[PDB]
Design a protein around this ligand. Structure first.
Ligand SMILES: C[C@]1(P(=O)(O)O)C[C@H](O)N(O)C1=O
Ligand SMILES: C[C@]1(P(=O)(O)O)C[C@H](O)N(O)C1=O
Ligand SMILES: [Mg+2]
Ligand SMILES: [Mg+2]
Lengths: 433, 433
């Protein structure tokens, strides 16, 4: 079936090399690219890097590309397996790599081939990508998700003092997904003028994901900024707020440092119970309906203590890193109620669907996610519709590595027609529609 | 030959609506999107916006999309012309529009259908897109271009006090184009560290084109940063400097204001003689080999005087707007010696090739260009190769709306393979190679 698998090296949205994979069947060419994170969790699968300090400062992927063309490609072509056999083709790759964290061939090399197989399998069944993903996941009631646009930036990769990473907007009161695109964009442009009118003309430049990073320090000031633009645009009750705290980035000696980019002074460190009491204030004072990574990736006691005392959504990112082993622990410990899905964290389409199936079996919500370094690949758009999760965050309505997914989700919605259903206020449990 | 033409509304890299067109033939689906400029010239073809401030601040393209679906689509379909009839189909839309500035259907409507015809016409010929454009333009010796990465930002869409808009790097001394992408990315990441020290952590967020907008006033100060990053990366030998002054954006009462973002003051105004005398210093003190829009779009006396007194490449952008009639005045006035090719300035693939050949047949270099508002479409990547212009500028190695062109340009070099040529130091007239 597979006539040729060919991989190359392309530059992501950050200017860093990443793996692109071309797969040739009888029906044509199928191309897929692998994203790359910035503030990574130490538990995810290995992103294969060259380490050549004189070529892209060590960030090349020539070795992961070589494992594809010289080993994985001839082994999958020799199989005789159709491109529709996603599980069998993914298993055989996990067999050849052998390692637990996919350290032999790299997760970006395995996922790149796995992503192109799934696209080729969709054509062989004469199905769109999202419908083929749904048949793989055992679903049939596709739903368009609620987009979460990261519009205010803080954390390890923002030149400000704001400690928390992402302040997002979720147009839950939209009529359709295309209607949600307009609400998120108009509030994004409205926020651009407010930031320019309070922090200067030189404070509107965007970060890796397209959001603004003004020089603020209090996290409640960021929420007030978001709510200020939400009301100013006239969507006070149709758009709520989500948060990616990424609290692992300032986990100092068992406490939390909401000013970790300042000179290290351990007097300002707060406890997990103090940090939770701050989240509770964010929930009562602001329309915060989702909080991602509220504590450290290993502070399971704080996760379970907080989730049991809140009614909003708790999203595990670095806590679960799309890993079925760590998801089961969070399910048993009730550490969170939502799973952030990043296919490159686990390294294969089959495992990513298995991680999503595991969470949904336990009443969890699932949010398909991007990485800081994205490409022009639009796979996760068809993934979030095929898995029927109800929520996806893949950047602000800015930079086309973010909008190629948003545009595709508008092509998917228009294609579904009357069959399409928008999650809306049911972004947590879309199956009740 | 055309089975169906259907257009929709997507969002470009800045969150603004733009026209995307699907064209169906017996050989499959063909997709193309239309960019949108920021420092737009007055003589550009009309971009039809809705002006309905109930959606997207009045920046929708529902009118232009409707003109495609309701009028242009059934016209080309009922015409029976083959998709390879690029000129017959483009002329069919020009006479149907019947307007000089294309202000009846909008240039974004005609171009999206034109860009999709050229993509479908390449498959009927069983050729890659760049080979079809090479045959549409009478070329045969494909040349890969020298990329110009805008790394320092000023002008009207910047938050700093920098008058001149763009400062670019051109890896003319690279071995191939894949090596040119590595040289530009290494300098871009090197520049990010240089700016981070001299200006702080908060001055590393990117602009519309992925470049930085550091708070600097002197235009010689921007050339000091670019030359420092070039040297601190070890490529003092292989990389030169280009500039997009966009002097039309600070043309004030026949004079020029190098501080138009500060509160206006006529004491700061200088003449084209003073402005031209400043360019003579930039050419000598720095490896500046190309200057775009050194004077206003209407100061033909300053263009003709400066061009005949320098040996560098003088590029016309807002002056010529890819228009055969405005280029024709520039070839007689000898205003410049390089055409900046923007397809949406003129509105059609056929006219964009005619305007390109009018320059190349008068001894002009040609540089294919992007706009500030771009999409994931990569048509101009196959366009700069097909026209054999030898130089393209389409942003910094950041934001995938820019990398989508550079990635495709990397796949074209690999696809051409043994017969692939790089413009190198012959980027102004690659016809010698
Ligand atoms: C910083 C990021 P990654 O790059 O994936 O580490 C971006 C994503 O929004 N997210 O959830 C993160 O934690
Ligand atoms: C700012 C821009 P446009 O948006 O096309 O006006 C971008 C391009 O680089 N260029 O030459 C310009 O003048
Ligand atoms: Mg996160
Ligand atoms: Mg210009």
């Amino acid at each position: 079936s597979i006539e040729k698998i060919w991989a190359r090296e392309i530059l992501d949205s950050r200017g860093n090399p990443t793996v692109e994979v071309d797969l040739y069947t009888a029906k044509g060419l199928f191309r897929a690219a692998v994203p790359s994170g910035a503030s990574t969790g130490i538990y995810e699968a290995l992103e294969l890097r060259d380490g050549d300090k004189q070529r892209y400062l060590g960030k090349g992927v020539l070795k992961a590309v070589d494992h594809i063309n010289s080993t994985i490609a001839p082994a999958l072509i020799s199989s005789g397996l159709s491109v529709v056999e996603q599980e069998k083709l993914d298993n055989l790759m996990l067999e050849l790599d052998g390692t637990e964290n996919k350290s032999k061939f790299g997760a970006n090399a395995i996922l790149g081939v796995s992503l192109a197989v799934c696209k080729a399998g969709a054509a062989e069944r004469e199905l769109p990508l999202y419908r083929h993903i749904a048949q793989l996941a055992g679903n049939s009631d596709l739903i368009l998700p609620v987009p979460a646009f990261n519009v205010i930036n803080g954390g390890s990769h923002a030149g400000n003092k704001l400690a928390m990473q992402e302040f997002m907007i979720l147009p839950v009161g939209a009529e359709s997904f295309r209607d949600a695109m307009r609400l998120g964009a108009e509030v994004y442009h409205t926020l651009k003028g407010v930031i320019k009118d309070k922090y200067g003309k030189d404070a509107t430049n965007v970060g890796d994901e397209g959001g603004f990073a003004p020089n603020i320090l209090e996290n409640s000031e960021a929420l007030e900024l978001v709510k200020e633009a939400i009301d100013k645009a006239g969507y006070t009750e149709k758009i709520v707020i989500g948060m990616d705290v990424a609290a692992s980035e300032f986990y100092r000696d068992g406490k939390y440092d909401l000013d970790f980019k300042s000179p290290t002074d351990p007097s300002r460190y707060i406890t997990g119970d103090q940090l939770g009491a701050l989240y509770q204030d964010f929930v009562r004072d602001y329309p915060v309906v989702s909080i991602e990574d509220p504590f450290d990736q290993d502070d399971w006691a704080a996760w379970s203590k907080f989730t049991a005392n809140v009614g909003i959504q708790i999203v595990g990112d670095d806590l679960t890193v799309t890993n079925p082993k760590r998801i089961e622990r969070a399910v048993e410990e009730k550490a969170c109620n939502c799973l952030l899905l990043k296919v490159n964290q686990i390294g294969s389409v089959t495992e990513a669907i298995q991680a999503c199936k595991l969470a949904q079996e336990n009443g969890w919500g699932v949010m398909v996610s991007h990485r800081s370094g994205e490409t022009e690949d639009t796979f996760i758009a068809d993934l979030v519709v095929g898995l029927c999760t109800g929520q996806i965050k893949t950047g602000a309505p800015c930079r086309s590595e973010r909008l190629a997914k948003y545009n595709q989700l508008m092509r998917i919605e228009e294609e579904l027609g009357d069959e399409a259903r928008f999650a809306g206020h049911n972004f947590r449990n879309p199956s009740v529609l």
